Amino acid sequence: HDAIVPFSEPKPVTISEKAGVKFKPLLDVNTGCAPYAAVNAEGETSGGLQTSGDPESGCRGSKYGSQVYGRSTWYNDVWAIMYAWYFPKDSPMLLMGHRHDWENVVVFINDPDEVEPTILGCSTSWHSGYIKYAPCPTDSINGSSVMIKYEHSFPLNHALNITKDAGAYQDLIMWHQMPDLARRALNDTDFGKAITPMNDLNFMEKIEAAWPFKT
Numbered sequence: 001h002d003a004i005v006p007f008s009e010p011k012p013v014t015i016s017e018k019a020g021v022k023f024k025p026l027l028d029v030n031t032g033c034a035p036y037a038a039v040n041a042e043g044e045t046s047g048g049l050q051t052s053g054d055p056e057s058g059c060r061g062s063k064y065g066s067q068v069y070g071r072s073t074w075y076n077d078v079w080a081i082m083y084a085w086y087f088p089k090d091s092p093m094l095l096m097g098h099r100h101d102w103e104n105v106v107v108f109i110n111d112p113d114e115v116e117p118t119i120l121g122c123s124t125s126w127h128s129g130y131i132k133y134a135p136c137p138t139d140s141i142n143g144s145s146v147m148i149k150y151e152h153s154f155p156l157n158h159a160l161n162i163t164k165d166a167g168a169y170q171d172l173i174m175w176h177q178m179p180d181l182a183r184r185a186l187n188d189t190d191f192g193k194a195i196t197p198m199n200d201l202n203f204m205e206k207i208e209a210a211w212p213f214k215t
């Protein structure tokens with residue numbers, strides 16, 4: 001329980017690293033787990049938590065701090081950045097819920113190599129699909145940080161959506177900055193009902209599913 005030590009956020013050097021840090025979302029959590037690190041540098045992964053009668057018990061926050069995962073690519077001449085969070089359980093009241101949970105938002109900007117790139121759209125994970133916004137509404141943008149809420153509405157489990165309430169930042173690690181042992185684990189580990197969204201199997205399919213523009 002709470003054994004995984006997160007990666008530190010390295011000081012950004014490349015275009016994509018700098019943009020990754022610049023456009024980190026704010027995450028506000030409502031009645032669920034705080035985000036936890038899913039994997040460590042040695043490739044061990046979180047065991048999650050069994051479902052129980054309280055949505056937050058055991059997962060109010062790691063003694064090691066939190067993590068947010070990032071991965072980016074050009075797609076259809078727009079720059080797409082995925083931010084993903086891992087939670088040890090998703091266990092709402094009245095619902096069966098499950099061990100493990102992965103959520104993500106995809107932020108779309110015009111070009112990462114501008115002094116002030118423009119957010120063009122944003123898509124928030126919703127039970128394997130997305131809620132798509134084009135444009136990303138201004139009231140949910142805090143500087144260059146989209147404001148995201150993790151919450152549940154009966155009769156479905158937790159999901160993400162934009163919000164006007166400012167949350168908090170987590171230490172960001174980008175896919176390429178994790179050691180090969182960690183990427184191997186994120187590529188291969190079975191999280192049951194939760195699917196790791198930025199690993200090599202799923203990332204491009206997810207970016208395509210997240211495309212919010214009326215093309």
Ligand SMILES: *[C@@H]1O[C@H](CO)[C@@H](O[C@@H]2O[C@H](CO)[C@@H](O[C@@H]3O[C@H](CO)[C@@H](O)[C@H](O)[C@@H]3O)[C@H](O)[C@H]2NC(C)=O)[C@H](O)[C@H]1NC(C)=O
Nearest residue numbers: 124126131132133137140149152153159160161162163164
């Ligand atoms: C995802 O988030 C969006 C953004 O907040 C949600 O859309 C919003 O839904 C509410 C419905 O409660 C709309 O609220 C307004 O509320 C008053 C209540 O008195 C109503 O009278 C107004 O006519 C108006 O509908 C709000 O306009 C709407 N915003 C947008 C941009 O659509 C959306 O429901 C969330 N989706 C999920 C699945 O949770």
Ligand SMILES: *[C@@H]1O[C@H](CO)[C@@H](O[C@@H]2O[C@H](CO)[C@@H](O[C@@H]3O[C@H](CO)[C@@H](O)[C@H](O)[C@@H]3O)[C@H](O)[C@H]2NC(C)=O)[C@H](O)[C@H]1NC(C)=O
Nearest residue numbers: 043178179180181182183184185186187188199200201202
């Ligand atoms: C998920 O990410 C991991 C880590 O980046 C990828 O595993 C790494 O990539 C290849 C897998 O084909 C391995 O290289 C191969 O090693 C064998 C045995 O030494 C050699 O015969 C081949 O010529 C090739 O060099 C690499 O060792 C492996 N690393 C680890 C730690 O597993 C994996 O490919 C990714 N999965 C997907 C679906 O992309």
Ligand SMILES: *[C@@H]1O[C@H](CO)[C@@H](O)[C@H](O)[C@H]1NC(C)=O
Nearest residue numbers: 026141142164165166167168
């Ligand atoms: C923007 O985020 C900060 C925390 O990062 C918060 O203190 C502030 O109230 C937010 N402002 C708006 C307008 O959302």
